[PDB]
Amino acid sequence: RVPNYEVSEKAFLLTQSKVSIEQRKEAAEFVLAKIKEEEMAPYYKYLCEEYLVNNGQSDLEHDEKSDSLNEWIKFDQELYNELCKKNESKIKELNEKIQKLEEDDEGELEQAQAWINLGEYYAQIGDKDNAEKTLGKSLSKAISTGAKIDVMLTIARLGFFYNDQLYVKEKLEAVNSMIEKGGDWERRNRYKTYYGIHCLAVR
Amino acid sequence: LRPGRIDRKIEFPPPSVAARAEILRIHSRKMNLTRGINLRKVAEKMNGCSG
């Protein structure tokens, strides 16, 4: 939940070369700490692209420019190794739980809660496509109206991560349908802000 | 209350603490709460004596 935007906010500031020298080097520290600890490994490869002509770059597997104005940028091979390991591990654990929920009937509430956890991991690693798929199975099992609304917001959030305004816009049409089915004022405030931020993103 | 005139007699007690929570939960669907409020907690703050 918490690194997903906070890493993106600092990573945007870091990209620019039209910021202050000081502000870019403060940001850069928060970004880098969080890749290693939280396993933001695939979005980190992605972010090496996003400079390109802007400076800072000092990566060991991805392009560098002649002018490195930053050094709180590094690619390490340990990052790649970790990925491979952690990936299989999380996948293996939950899977088996899902099969267990199939054997003895419990699969309405708990298998969707397992697949929510799978999209949060997928989302963590920076995959919008495969987070969304898992968050798709969560729907099919019959759950509360509250849970269904919460899930669509999460998917739309992954749109903000890659800064794709259209990806936000499309998902937030579907929430407009369900919002009055649940009828909550709680998840309507969330809706007001979710939309808030989306409307702020366009002109 | 003479013979054969009344043949089923239904006593109704004051509410249980499980039953008093189930009346509270019906009323909470009209209202908009905040999550983390247990209405089993509320039913135990109360003791009631009627519905």
């Binding site: 004022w185 | 009209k30 209202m31 908009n32």
Partner: protein, 49 residues
């Protein structure tokens, strides 16, 4: 109890609606008429306008 009952649906009815309390209805005032029941109605009416 009167500022809840009379004054709150005039200033805005929708305050009730959005919390999800449905509004109280009618007010009965009872008592000896020497108690200033009648007096209270005139007091809040001049005030709410």
């Amino acid at each position: 109890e009167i500022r809840e009952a009379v004054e709150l649906p005039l200033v805005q009815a929708d305050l009730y609606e959005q919390i999800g309390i449905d509004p109280p209805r009618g007010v009965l005032l009872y008592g000896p008429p020497g108690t200033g029941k009648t007096m209270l109605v005139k007091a809040v009416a001049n005030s709410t306008k």
